[PDB]
Amino acid sequence: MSSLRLVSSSTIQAANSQLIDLTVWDLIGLERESIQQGLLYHHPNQVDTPNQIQHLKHSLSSTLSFFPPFAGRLVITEYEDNTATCFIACNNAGALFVHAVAENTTISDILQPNKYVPPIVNSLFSLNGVKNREGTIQPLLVVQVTELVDGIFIGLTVNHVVADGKSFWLFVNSWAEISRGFQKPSKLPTLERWFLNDTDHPIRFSFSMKFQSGQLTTRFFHFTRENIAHLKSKANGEVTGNTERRISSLQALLAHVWRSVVRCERIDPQEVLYYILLIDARTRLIPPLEDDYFGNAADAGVVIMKAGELLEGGLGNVAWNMNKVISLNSDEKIKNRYKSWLRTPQLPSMGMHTTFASQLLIIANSPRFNVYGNDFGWGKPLAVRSSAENKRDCKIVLFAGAEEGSIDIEVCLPYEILEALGNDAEFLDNH
Ligand SMILES: CC(C)(O)[C@H]1CC[C@](C)([C@H]2[C@H](O)C[C@@]3(C)[C@@H]4C[C@H](O[C@@H]5O[C@H](CO)[C@@H](O)[C@H](O)[C@H]5O)[C@H]5C(C)(C)[C@@H](O[C@@H]6OC[C@@H](O)[C@H](O)[C@H]6O)CC[C@@]56C[C@@]46CC[C@]23C)O1
Numbered sequence: 001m002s003s004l005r006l007v008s009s010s011t012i013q014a015a016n017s018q019l020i021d022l023t024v025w026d027l028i029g030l031e032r033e034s035i036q037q038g039l040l041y042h043h044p045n046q047v048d049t050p051n052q053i054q055h056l057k058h059s060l061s062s063t064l065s066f067f068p069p070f071a072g073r074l075v076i077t078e079y080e081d082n083t084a085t086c087f088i089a090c091n092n093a094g095a096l097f098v099h100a101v102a103e104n105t106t107i108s109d110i111l112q113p114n115k116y117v118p119p120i121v122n123s124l125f126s127l128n129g130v131k132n133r134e135g136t137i138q139p140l141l142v143v144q145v146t147e148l149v150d151g152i153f154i155g156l157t158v159n160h161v162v163a164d165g166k167s168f169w170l171f172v173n174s175w176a177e178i179s180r181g182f183q184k185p186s187k188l189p190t191l192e193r194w195f196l197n198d199t200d201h202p203i204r205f206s207f208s209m210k211f212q213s214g215q216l217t218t219r220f221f222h223f224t225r226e227n228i229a230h231l232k233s234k235a236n237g238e239v240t241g242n243t244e245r246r247i248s249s250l251q252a253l254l255a256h257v258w259r260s261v262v263r264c265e266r267i268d269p270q271e272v273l274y275y276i277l278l279i280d281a282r283t284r285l286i287p288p289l290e291d292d293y294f295g296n297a298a299d300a301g302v303v304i305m306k307a308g309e310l311l312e313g314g315l316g317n318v319a320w321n322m323n324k325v326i327s328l329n330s331d332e333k334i335k336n337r338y339k340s341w342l343r344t345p346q347l348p349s350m351g352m353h354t355t356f357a358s359q360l361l362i363i364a365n366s367p368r369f370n371v372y373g374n375d376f377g378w379g380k381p382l383a384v385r386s387s388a389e390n391k392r393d394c395k396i397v398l399f400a401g402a403e404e405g406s407i408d409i410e411v412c413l414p415y416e417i418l419e420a421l422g423n424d425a426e427f428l429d430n431h
Pocket of ligand 1: 028274276278299300301302304341347348349350351352360362364365
């Protein structure tokens, strides 16, 4: 029968102290979860596995020289007036490398296609359930490499106060480059983080003070470039006054997914619905941040619509509203939101009490991030998976698909809704 065991855990320091102040975007995650995403590889031929594991360890240490935050620790100071400060010490305490073996477990055991994510996937990551504020002691980066019968899985656990999704995949891209033989990564990080005024740091903040919580399931759906292009043309074709085809491919897809979920759940048309986009500030500040600004740089944009209007008003109207919410995340709004946060620096609560699955839907990650170029020397990955640790939030996570211009979405919802989506011919997914 199949089994899973850890064979070794090793501290990995940078191959070759500095302090980093954290801004509002970074602090907001202190009480929340890590980023856990990983890559599946098939080994067509035999591989010298001990040498492969050693090569991943040494290239990881080399990459860490260029990303010192991932080898450091958080420093939190708690004060008597119920406030706190936090920063990153690049003290080279080290990341963690975990070597696991999944005896008699295969690629296809992990990647049940058109099926739900199997429970084994969650055990391909280490430090599940650890909040980002525990980075004062816990490594900010854990890599778990799990040997399979016909390949390996490379699963990263990354502290979400240090990095967002963009910065996560910057590190993965650069590590694969170093592993392939590059001497430097092709994109170097910008480590200095953004504050409206140099006097703002260290920010003194306060900690603290769901429908089907603990019972959600996770399933992938694949969207071809053609089906996406169909959705974009339809959405722009429905909103003509005042358009030169400004609704984007992703806006139309997300509008379609929103409509499909709500249609499958069958809810009262008077329900108010909240759709949570994460809008990058890097390109929207004036002056803009560096493209490879390393840290968090995104703010929620909340799309609010009645269920009746969402469905009866047509795809283009939903996508146009999302477009407009995105367009309101201007340089003015970003800086004023920052300033009012400094005036009431409380870390958020996870929000309202939800009574159905479509009520509050969070949209995470991006199809812009480079998933399939992560060749460490043995070929491109077959797939990307997350830990699927989250069983509380109704959530859609966006991934680049294997074929050019396609998108995989990882959907966390009640089981019967995922079943309805898989049986819905209006859901334009494939395979
Ligand atoms: C009246 C309105 C306008 O309809 C109201 C009704 C209520 C709501 C629906 C809005 C609130 O208004 C504000 C709101 C968005 C919350 C506060 C957070 O949002 C941040 O709030 C702070 C202020 O506290 C702002 O300064 C930031 O700009 C903003 O982004 C966010 C994040 C950043 C933690 C977000 O995190 C991702 O989790 C998943 C990971 O996979 C990702 O990687 C990671 O990012 C999860 C959702 C979540 C918890 C919630 C939930 C929804 C809320 C509760 O809208």
